[PDB]
Design a protein around this nucleic acid. Structure first.
Ligand SMILES: [Mg+2]
Ligand SMILES: [Mg+2]
Ligand SMILES: [Mg+2]
Ligand SMILES: [Mg+2]
Ligand SMILES: [Mg+2]
Ligand SMILES: [Mg+2]
Ligand SMILES: [Mg+2]
Ligand SMILES: [Mg+2]
Ligand SMILES: [Mg+2]
Ligand SMILES: [Mg+2]
Ligand SMILES: [Mg+2]
Ligand SMILES: [Mg+2]
Ligand SMILES: [Mg+2]
Ligand SMILES: [Mg+2]
Ligand SMILES: [Mg+2]
Ligand SMILES: [Mg+2]
Ligand SMILES: [Mg+2]
Ligand SMILES: [Mg+2]
Lengths: 63, 225, 216, 124, 128, 19, 51, 109
RNA sequence: GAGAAAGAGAGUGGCGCGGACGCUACGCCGCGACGAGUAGGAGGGCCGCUGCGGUGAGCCUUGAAGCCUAGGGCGCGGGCCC
RNA sequence: CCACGCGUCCCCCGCGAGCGCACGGGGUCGGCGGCGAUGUCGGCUACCCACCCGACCCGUCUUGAAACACGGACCAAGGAGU
């Protein structure tokens, strides 16, 4: 065989949001494109942050 | 107008064609100089053994610095120290094989593992046919079979390793960047030995196949390859 | 335009010329040979002149269509393959036909035709085998030859001549070619004693007869 | 808009039909009749459609005009083409190409016109 | 002749026998529809030799030749005549099938509409 | 010669001299 | 890409290593030349057998 | 007007002790009994010829009862001149110890 | 796709009306390595049952549900269509 | 011999064309032959039978079940994380 351990073989992170919101998924369709096709990593961070959950993107305040 | 655009792109295409052709002349004359170097390396040891014999003295040759290590025993029931040293030697499947340069840490790592491997000192023909027949490269942690010189040059160009025979020169004459060239090579997946094994579970001294057969590994790469 | 030469590299083995690139620079003499730098017809019609378009657009389009293949290189068509015999077959060899309705019969081999096939007659006076083609693989070649080099096989008989048309009736030129080659072969094999009885007899395996042990 | 409408119509429309591990869309102006954003006949500002005529010869080509989007009665324009098979396809080709009128599916319109004309010449 | 498809590959299937559930041959109460058996001493579940096979994923068909009939087509279950203008474009890949519950005087209308639209029907002469 | 920036004039000179 | 074998196949070997063409030219010339030399020594030894 | 096939006997399938692999016949050819000697027969068309109840076709003739399962001879086996064959459908074990004809016609001579 | 940080960048002076497929972006495609499993945990079900809101200008006395079937089939399978 | 020419200052001694063959980013033939209307052609699977190899009966509690461990004659419906 091969002596791999397959415990951590699967990265747990999100590929898409768990929301069926459609404006959020159209923002995803725009930033999938901008992150796939620019070299700037701001778009990858904004893609990963549109992917997140409500408790992972908490509201900052105006202060 | 496009009478300028097409001649500019033709000049660029001709420029990169001329660049590629000069690279191929570079690779040619480098392989020639490597052939000359291997001639001189092979005749130097014979010439010095001859001069020692005609002076009556002996000539202990250079203690060999490059081994090829093959995992001969399977996954099942392995002690954990031996497990960790095997998976630092990158011998995970059975009948894998990696090149390993020799020094004090490495020899003792090998004789912790010694019942599980067969390792020896490979010839230039062994290094050649291992890189050409089973030699693939760990590119972007994918196992891309080495079909061009660009697969080797894009990963190992910064160590002045730009073609496959230059990779062979590095592995055989263990150079400065042996770590990087060998770690570029994926662990070799050899077949089962044609003709067979005399005994898997005992050392080569004891009428078996484990352990350190010295240059009799060049009998065995030829039939596991 | 100049008259073409042939390849100044004699072929040493396949794919390797006997002369290197600098020797061939010298032999080609490139050193003194350097250099520097539809769809419409207009026809008259009795009106005016009408610009007919040849290569017209298609009338129909199928609702779903296959794509184009990838381009590969060495896959030549059959008519331009390279053709080989065995070593044991030279013109004049007696052969043992193993597969047709003329199975087992001993036969004089004539020549190697253009589509790989052998030309064949164990002469029709002897064992009723005409000018036939036979496949090289399906044939045991014995070591019994005749001095056939002084015959004139007709040049008008090839694969297009023996290839089937579509009751089969023998034409006249079949008989004429059969006679014109048998009159040259049959006295040449009556000169070897007991050879015509050999060519009339048929090969067969009896008890205690094994083809690996037996030399032919 | 168009993507906003597609994010609703993509799964819960009534023209959608899902069986036998296939999927289709039975909407009135769908070239190739399949469920896609590219070919959908309701959610675009400009759309062609290829239909057989009420007379049993030739093809009515449906265009969606530009101005009256929210006005479904004076939105579509019919043109009946009752010609030979070559000039019917040439008319559909020029109509979609040289107007630059949604050229994603000029070839799909030509296929569908040819399939209708195949079915409209008599049976074997 | 019939209506030939676009492309007709050799449909290689990995297994042709069905999977019968373990000890369906013994009892009548055990219907032969496969149930992976959760026994702790079960000779099949732990894969002995010479036993009833289990339906792993590796027996899955090729994706290019999956759900593909021996004629080269794929089915599509059709209820009325308005579900053949659907396959008007998938003429060369997807073929039509008429449902069981569909009447005769509608089935023959379906059949002649599909004969006009050049769509092959799997059961074109069903009831009559 | 054969590495791109520093061998640019060299490869250009060879390309001119090939005529 | 399908990995063709540079030890059996030849133009893959030249695609990886263009000096292998002149090494495999010079060694075929060497084999043929040494073969002619040994046949000439054997024929001279047969002339010595006749003498 | 005589025999044009060598005599061979379908000894068994290619097998281990607790496993057999039915895709490969083991053929024992009469007269050859060593690997030095089995070299002539490699690649020869072999055939298992059998009769049946109802008539089937026969090419270059009229229908009769006899039937075949063609094959070819792939590689030697053992040291006693045993050989391996592969038939285009696997042989029934009806055929154990019954005469497979092994032809001559894919000749390499 | 090409061993080499970055432009097939703009500026100032010395006849024939033609071009396949695609992109349910939850879609489609390309590379690599991998596949044991009880207790257990998780995911996907265009697997299945009963009922409700939508919908198929759905099906049905020119014969629905059910039941039987040495018939044609699909799917690894649950099952399903004839 | 993977060496190409010219013109000049120094020292020590960037666009030439055309064709063609192919050990070159995975198979093609621009090669063939037979049989076919009342007895034959194709259908792995599904019906019966034969032969070879394998092959102990399920659930369960168990350190360990084919067990001389207990439950089970056979079938249809009901039947247990709400
Ligand atoms: Mg594995
Ligand atoms: Mg696991
Ligand atoms: Mg995990
Ligand atoms: Mg052990
Ligand atoms: Mg062997
Ligand atoms: Mg038990
Ligand atoms: Mg257990
Ligand atoms: Mg598992
Ligand atoms: Mg048994
Ligand atoms: Mg119990
Ligand atoms: Mg208890
Ligand atoms: Mg107990
Ligand atoms: Mg337990
Ligand atoms: Mg007991
Ligand atoms: Mg008791
Ligand atoms: Mg109890
Ligand atoms: Mg009881
Ligand atoms: Mg129940």
């Amino acid at each position: 065989g091969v002596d791999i351990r397959h415990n951590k073989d699967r990265k747990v992170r999100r590929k898409e949001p768990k929301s069926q919101d459609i404006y959020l998924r159209l923002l995803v369709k725009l930033y999938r494109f901008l992150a796939r096709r620019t070299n700037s990593t701001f778009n990858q961070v904004v893609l990963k942050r549109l992917f997140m959950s409500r408790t992972n993107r908490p509201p900052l305040s105006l202060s | 107008n496009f009478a300028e655009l097409k001649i500019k792109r033709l000049r660029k295409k001709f420029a990169q064609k001329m660049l590629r052709k000069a690279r191929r002349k570079l690779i040619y004359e480098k392989a020639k100089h490597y052939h000359k170097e291997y001639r001189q390396m092979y005749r130097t040891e014979i010439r010095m053994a001859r001069m020692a014999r005609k002076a009556g003295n002996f000539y202990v040759p250079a203690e060999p610095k490059l081994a090829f290590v093959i995992r001969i025993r399977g996954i099942n029931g392995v002690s954990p120290k031996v497990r960790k040293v095997l998976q630092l030697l990158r011998l995970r499947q059975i009948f894998n094989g990696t090149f390993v340069k020799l020094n004090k840490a490495s020899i003792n790592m090998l004789r912790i593992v010694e019942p599980y491997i067969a390792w020896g000192y490979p010839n230039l023909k062994s290094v050649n046919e291992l890189i050409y027949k089973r030699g693939y490269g760990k590119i972007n942690k994918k196992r891309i079979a080495l079909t061009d010189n660009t697969l080797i040059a894009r990963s190992l160009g910064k160590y002045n390793i730009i073609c496959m025979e230059d990779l062979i020169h590095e592995i055989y004459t263990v150079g400065k960047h042996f770590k990087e060239a060998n770690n570029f090579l994926w662990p070799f997946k050899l077949s089962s030995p044609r003709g067979g094994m005399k005994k898997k579970t005992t050392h080569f001294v004891e009428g078996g196949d484990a352990g350190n057969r010295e240059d009799q590994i060049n009998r065995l790469i030829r039939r596991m390859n | 335009k100049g008259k073409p030469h042939c390849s100044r590299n004699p072929v040493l083995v396949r794919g390797i010329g006997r002369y290197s690139r600098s020797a061939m620079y010298s032999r080609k003499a490139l050193y003194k040979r350097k250099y520097a730098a539809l769809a419409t017809v207009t026809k008259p019609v009795g009106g005016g002149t009408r610009v007919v378009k040849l290569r017209k657009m298609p009338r129909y389009y199928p609702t779903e269509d296959v794509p184009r293949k990838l381009l590969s290189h060495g896959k030549k068509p059959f008519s331009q393959h390279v053709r080989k015999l065995r070593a044991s077959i030279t013109p004049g060899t007696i052969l043992i036909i193993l597969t047709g309705r003329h199975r087992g019969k001993r036969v004089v081999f004539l020549k190697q035709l253009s589509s790989g096939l052998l030309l064949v007659t164990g002469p029709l006076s002897l064992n009723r085998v005409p000018l036939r083609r036979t496949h090289q693989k399906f044939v045991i070649a014995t070591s019994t030859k005749i001095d056939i080099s002084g015959v004139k096989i007709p040049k008008h008989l090839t694969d297009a001549y023996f290839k089937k048309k579509k009751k089969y009736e023998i034409t006249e030129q079949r008989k004429v070619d059969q006679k014109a080659v048998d009159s040259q072969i049959l006295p040449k094999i009556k000169a070897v004693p007991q050879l015509q009885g050999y060519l009339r007899s048929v090969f067969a395996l009896t008890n205690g007869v094994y083809p690996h042990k037996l030399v032919f | 808009s168009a993507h906003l409408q597609w994010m609703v119509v993509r799964n819960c429309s009534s023209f959608l039909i899902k069986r036998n591990k296939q999927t289709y869309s039975t909407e009135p102006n769908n070239l190739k009749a399949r469920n896609s954003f590219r070919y959908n006949g309701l959610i675009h500002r400009k759309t062609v459609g290829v239909e057989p005529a009420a007379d049993g010869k030739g093809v009515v080509v449906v265009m969606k005009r530009r101005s009256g989007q929210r006005k479904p009665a004076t939105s579509y324009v019919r043109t009946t083409i009752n010609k030979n098979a070559r000039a019917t396809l040439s008319s559909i080709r020029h109509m979609i190409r040289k107007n630059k009128y949604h050229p994603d599916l000029r070839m799909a319109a030509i296929r569908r016109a040819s399939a209708i004309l195949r079915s409209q010449k008599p049976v074997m | 002749a019939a209506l030939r498809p676009l492309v007709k590959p050799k449909i290689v299937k990995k297994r042709t026998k069905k999977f019968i559930r373990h000890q369906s041959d013994r009892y009548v109460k055990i219907k032969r529809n496969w149930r992976k058996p959760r026994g702790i001493d079960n000779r099949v579940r732990r894969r002995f030799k010479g036993q009833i096979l289990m339906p792993n994923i590796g027996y899955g068909s090729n994706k290019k030749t999956k759900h593909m009939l021996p004629s080269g087509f794929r089915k599509f279950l059709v209820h009325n005549v308005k579900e053949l203008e659907v396959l008007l474009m998938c003429n060369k890949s997807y073929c039509a099938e008429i449902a069981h519950n569909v009447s005769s005087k509608n089935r023959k209308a379906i059949v002649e509409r599909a004969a006009q639209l050049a769509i092959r029907v799997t059961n074109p002469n069903a009831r009559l | 010669i054969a590495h791109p920036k520093l061998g640019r004039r060299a490869r250009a000179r060879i390309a001119r001299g090939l005529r | 890409v399908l990995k063709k074998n540079p030890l059996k196949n030849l133009r893959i070997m030249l695609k990886l290593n263009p000096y292998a063409k002149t090494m495999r030219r010079n060694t075929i010339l060497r084999q043929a030349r040494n073969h002619k030399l040994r046949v000439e020594r054997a024929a001279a030894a047969l002339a010595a057998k006749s003498d | 007007s005589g025999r044009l096939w060598c005599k061979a006997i379908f000894a068994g399938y290619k097998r281990g002790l607790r496993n057999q692999r039915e895709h490969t016949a083991l053929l024992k050819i009469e007269g050859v009994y060593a690997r030095d000697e089995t070299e002539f027969y490699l690649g020869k068309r072999c055939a298992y010829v059998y009769k049946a109840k109802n008539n089937t076709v026969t090419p270059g003739g009229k229908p009769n009862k006899t039937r075949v399962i063609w094959g070819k001879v792939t590689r030697a086996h053992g040291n006693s001149g045993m050989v391996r064959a592969k038939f285009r459908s696997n042989l029934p074990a009806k055929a154990i110890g019954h005469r497979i004809r092994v032809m001559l016609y894919p000749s390499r001579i």
